[PDB]
Amino acid sequence: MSAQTVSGPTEDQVEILEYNFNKVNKHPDPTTLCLIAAEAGLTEEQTQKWFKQRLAEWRRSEGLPSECRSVTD
């Protein structure tokens, strides 16, 4: 029962998404989202919602001062 992508993507999708995240450019992209979403078996909405959540974790783990090279003192 409820064997569908209700509310958010399923585990199987996270597998394709994680690969995509590590292969695209580590950033939510417009052209990229639509194209990769279709191949992942999702839509932009779902891909955006997922990619953005990893964005926060990415910044924590890799330690990035925002986007550009700026020394946070």
UniProtKB/Swiss-Prot annotation:
Q: Which UniProt keywords apply?
A: Cytoplasm, Developmental protein, Homeobox, Nucleus, Repressor, Transcription, Transcription regulation
Copy out the induction comment: By the transcription factor NKX2-5 that acts as a direct regulator.
Gene3D superfamilies in the cross-refs: Homeodomain-like (1.10.10.60)
The organism's taxonomy opens as:
Eukaryota, Metazoa, Chordata, Craniata, Vertebrata
Q: Name one GO molecular function term.
A: DNA binding
Q: What task does this protein carry out? A: Atypical homeodomain protein which does not bind DNA and is required to modulate cardiac growth and development. Acts via its interaction with SRF, thereby modulating the expression of SRF-dependent cardiac-specific genes and cardiac development. Prevents SRF-dependent transcription either by inhibiting SRF binding to DNA or by recruiting histone deacetylase (HDAC) proteins that prevent transcription by SRF. Overexpression causes cardiac hypertrophy. Acts as a co-chaperone for HSPA1A and HSPA1B chaperone proteins and assists in chaperone-mediated protein refolding.
GO BP terms: namely:
chaperone-mediated protein complex assembly; heart development; lung alveolus development; negative regulation of cell differentiation; negative regulation of transcription by RNA polymerase II; positive regulation of gap junction assembly; positive regulation of skeletal muscle tissue regeneration; positive regulation of striated muscle cell differentiation
The signal peptide here is none
The subcellular localization recorded is:
Nucleus; Cytoplasm
- Which SUPFAM superfamilies has this protein been placed in? Homeodomain-like (SSF46689)
The gene it comes from is: Hopx
Give expression by tissue. Expressed in the embryonic and adult heart and in the adult brain, liver, lung, skeletal muscle, intestine and spleen. Throughout embryonic and postnatal development, it is expressed in the myocardium.
Annotation: DNA-binding region = 3-62
User: Quaternary structure?
Assistant: Interacts with serum response factor (SRF). Component of a large complex containing histone deacetylases such as HDAC2. Interacts with the acetylated forms of HSPA1A and HSPA1B. Interacts with HSPA8.
Task: Please summarize what the entry says happens upon disruption of the gene.
Answer: Mice display partial embryonic lethality and heart failure.
Q: Name one GO cellular component term.
A: cytoplasm
Q: What is the protein name for this chain?
A: Homeodomain-only protein
> Where mainly located?
nucleus
